[PDB]
Every structure is written in structure tokens, then in C-alpha cells.
Enzyme design. Sequence first.
Site, PDB file in Angstrom:
ATOM      1  N   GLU B  68      -2.212  -9.047   4.507  1.00  0.00           N
ATOM      2  CA  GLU B  68      -2.744  -7.704   4.618  1.00  0.00           C
ATOM      3  C   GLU B  68      -3.629  -7.382   3.421  1.00  0.00           C
ATOM      4  OE1 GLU B  68       0.796  -5.406   4.801  1.00  0.00           O
ATOM      5  OE2 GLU B  68       1.386  -6.280   6.706  1.00  0.00           O
ATOM      6  N   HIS B  77      -2.038  -9.130  -0.096  1.00  0.00           N
ATOM      7  CA  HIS B  77      -0.722  -9.732  -0.170  1.00  0.00           C
ATOM      8  C   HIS B  77      -0.444 -10.417   1.165  1.00  0.00           C
ATOM      9  CE1 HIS B  77       0.197  -5.780   1.683  1.00  0.00           C
ATOM     10  NE2 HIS B  77       1.097  -6.467   2.366  1.00  0.00           N
ATOM     11  N   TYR B 136       9.041  -4.655  11.578  1.00  0.00           N
ATOM     12  CA  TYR B 136       7.986  -4.284  10.636  1.00  0.00           C
ATOM     13  C   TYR B 136       6.688  -5.031  10.920  1.00  0.00           C
ATOM     14  CZ  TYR B 136       5.642  -2.843   6.246  1.00  0.00           C
ATOM     15  OH  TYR B 136       4.759  -2.294   5.332  1.00  0.00           O
TER      16      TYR B 136
HETATM   17 ZN   LIG Z   1       2.450  -5.305   3.540  1.00  0.00          ZN
END
Ligand SMILES: [Zn+2]
Lengths: 368, 164
Positions: B68, B77, B136
Site C-alpha cells: 500500500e 509498506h 482487513y
Molecule cells: Zn496498511
Amino acid sequence: KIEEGKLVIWINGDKGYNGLAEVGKKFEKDTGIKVTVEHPDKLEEKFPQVAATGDGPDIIFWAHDRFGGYAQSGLLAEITPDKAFQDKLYPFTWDAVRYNGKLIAYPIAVEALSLIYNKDLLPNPPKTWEEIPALDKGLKAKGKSALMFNLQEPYFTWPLIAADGGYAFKYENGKYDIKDVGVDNAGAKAGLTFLVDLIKNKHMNADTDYSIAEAAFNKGETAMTINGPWAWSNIDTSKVNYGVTVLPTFKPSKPFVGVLSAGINAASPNKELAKEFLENYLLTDEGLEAVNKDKPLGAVALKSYEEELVKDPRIAATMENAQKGEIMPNIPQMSAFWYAVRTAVINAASGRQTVDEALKDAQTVPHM
Amino acid sequence: RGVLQVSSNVLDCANDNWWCSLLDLDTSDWEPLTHTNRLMAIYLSSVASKLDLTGGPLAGCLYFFQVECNKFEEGYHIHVVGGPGLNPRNLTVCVEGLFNNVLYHFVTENVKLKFLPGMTTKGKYFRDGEQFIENYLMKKINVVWCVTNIDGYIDTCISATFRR
Ligand SMILES: [Zn+2]
Ligand SMILES: OC[C@H]1O[C@H](O[C@H]2[C@H](O)[C@@H](O)[C@@H](O)O[C@@H]2CO)[C@H](O)[C@@H](O)[C@@H]1O
């Protein structure tokens, strides 16, 4: 959508949602609060996706294994049943809904797969799995098939897979060790190898699902299926003279035992209306009765009504299977387990992987 | 599970061995790539490829990578989500070795990445990678690229349509 002064209840499609609705109408009657009962697909995955921010329901019904995840993500309100009520329900059932010291749902009933056989087509149902191939060949001759059950959901396959030594997480000192999965030991590998070979030898077809096997058994095209208590209403309607008995041994089949529970969305305004509905309208003799009459619940968590249900030979057959299986853990890792062994089961039945590869995979999945 | 930080400097140091690959970046169900976005794709794809035929502790492992944009600094990261012979005592070294050894060929100076393993508040390594992926990383749509060898996420991880 949730609204203050109304109750919205989700509950899966194979259970007696209509009979629950009859309990909500009695509630509406006594209080002026309308209850509505809805059975969406995949609701054990839909609830975590929309509970916080979207349109969750006021009360959610499922087996107690999913709630540890919910309560970890904090999608769930506390529950506050006093000692007087806690006493009306079975100690082990309150244990299945206790997470990190706190009761996180209302227990409702105990579920366990059994063996359901057609007495006409099979007067003495097999006591062992290994007898099933020979029994399917002697039944393919007559135009039928020995056994058909749902092969997509690992709930059904697992009993065979844990029979010779498979397990989920090593339960030691009251605590489940998530470092210690046993889906790749010898005893699991054996359980599943037997299941795949039943498909290779045309005795079952990897594509069979819940809808297909309920139709084969309710129409008499197969002598045996594997299912829980919810399934008996539609077998009664189909007039099949059936019997409910212990599951086949392999090399006992341990099913994972579900406790149907109710939890309360953190996003409900009616947290005290929900608590009154569950403690005073649904977990009563008449309330449970109204639900059981639509689709059986199995062995209800309320002592006072379990005492009558257990006289039914079917319900003693289900408790028998439950005593040989294990109560499902509730920890949040259980959705990762069920993800891993669902993948392995469908890949080994369809040929995409060997039993040994698809179990070496689902050994790593649940504890990364 | 953990994270590796990738400074803006690491992208400045990129060489032509990094940029000049024809490898199949399937953006039919994605968003187009910017030159540094595509650099992260190609890296993830090539770390994945090298992982597939890497032995030792990393043999037979399952992985989920996701890179991302850093929302409040420049740079990126990478989310990394196990296997036999992969334990808390070698995990950081094995994950740093895998990524530095591919990157070494792609940068014009000495650049090393650091792996920060996701810990609990009670000091324990996280062992929930799968529900992490499920609850997530697959919910981001904000996600530059993603590669994985976990059956079922192999096709969906680079579906915009699915994640939505
Ligand atoms: Zn992230
Ligand atoms: O299939 C894996 C599944 O097991 C359990 O789901 C059962 C549930 O216990 C029953 O109430 C019934 O309706 O069928 C379900 C099988 O689809 C677990 O509750 C669930 O988490 C898991 O996915």
C-alpha cells in the site's frame, strides 16, 4: 434496517424461523413492539461485515463457534442474565458462550449431526464406515445409493476426519493452544483419504451439496444421509420411514457439537428489549416449543423443556453422537480453521489436490 | 504477520533490471498502475516467484503479500502474512532475507528492508494471519498490488470487483 422500538432477528434458513416469528408476535402482543425474523444467506459472514456500520440485526442466531470472533471485534453487546435465570439452563451450555470470562450470547440448544437412514431401504444401518462401499454396490444394483450427504461444508465431513485422530486446536489445561493444529496428523489424513476414495469409487459424488442430498433422501433415492435436527421436519413431510442412530465408526465418528446461540448487536438501541425477548419469551417452555414445532432445535439449553424433548429416541441419538464428538471451540481462530478445512475438503474431493497436499495447506492456514 | 517499510529512497534507487520485466500484471480487473505503483507490483510478483522455489525454513509455506501507499509519509509498506519450520525465532530473519535478496538485484545502491512482526498488546506474536486477510487486507480496494499462493485468494486478490 435497525430501529428503536422494533426487533430485527437474523437466523439461518434451515431452522424454524417461522416458529420464532410466532414468538415475536406473542412479544409484539404483550409490549407493542413488532418483531421481524429474517433468514439471509451466509449470515455468519454478513453480520461481521455490516454490524458496526451497516444494517445489522438486533439479535443474531448461529452456532457458538463464531461469537469469539464477533466479541473480539467488539460487534457484540454484553449480556446480563441473573443467577436465577442462569440456573434454568444447562451449565455446559453457558460454557460454550463464555469468552474471556464474559458470557457473550444466549445459549439455545445443542446440535450434533447423526446418521439418518431409511428403514425400508436399510433395516440394519451400517455400524462402520468401511462397510459402506460394499453396501453402496449392493444398493446401486437396486437402483439406489448407500449414502449422500453435504460435501461442501466441512461441518459434515469433519466427523469422519476427527474419528482416527484429527482435531482443530490442542485443548490443554482449559485453554486451546492455537499453535497446535491437528488437521495433518495420520488420523486426519486417514479420515479424509477414506472420503475421497468414496468419491473415486463412484459411491458418492464430490458435487453433492445440502440441497441435493436432502432431496435424494427425502425422495428415497439413497438409504442414508448425515444431518442435524433441523432436517427432520422435511423428512416428516416426505413420509419416509426413517430412523436416527449413531454415526458410523471409522477404523467413533466425533462430530463437532454446536450450541445454537443468540447474540446482541453492539449497534442495537433495543438491547433491553432483546434481553427481555430472549429470557422471557423465547427461552421459556412455550417459546422453545413454538420454535421446535417448525424445525426441531435438538436438545434445548433450558433444562425444564429438555426433560421432555429427550424422551424422543431421536434426541437421545443426537446426544449420543454429541458425547462422542467435541464441543466446538469459540475462539476467533475458528473461522480460520473452518476456512482451512473447507478448502482442503473441496480440493481433495474434486481432485485439485492430493489428500496430503490439501492437508499440509490447511495446517498452516489457521495459525499464521 | 507483519509489515516492511519501503522508503521513497528505495524507489529512487531502482535500476533497469527492476523496470524492464514483461511479467503479467493483470490490470483488467484492477486500477491502472503509476510507474512507482508498477514497481511495487513487479517487486511483489518477483518476491512471490522467488519464494515459490525457496527452501530451508520457508519451504512449503503459505504467504499473502499486499503493498500500500503510506498515507502520511512518502513511500510504501508491504503487508506480509506461515509454514512448518517458520517460527518466532527465525521469522524476522527469513522474511527479511527473502525480500532483500530479490531487491538487491533491483537497486543501484545497498538498500535493506526491515520486517516488523505484528505483536499482541501482551507481547505475543500474532497468529491470526488468515482472519487478518479475511477481515482487513481483502477489504481494501488503497491497495496497490497483492500476490498470494493461498488457494481461493489466488484469483480474488487482484480482483477489484470481488473486494468491492
Ligand atoms: Zn496498511
Ligand atoms: O461448515 C462449517 C461450519 O460449521 C458450523 O456450521 C454449521 C452450523 O453449526 C449449523 O447450525 C448448520 O446450520 O450448518 C452449518 C454448516 O454450514 C459452524 O457454525 C460454522 O462456523 C462453520 O462455517
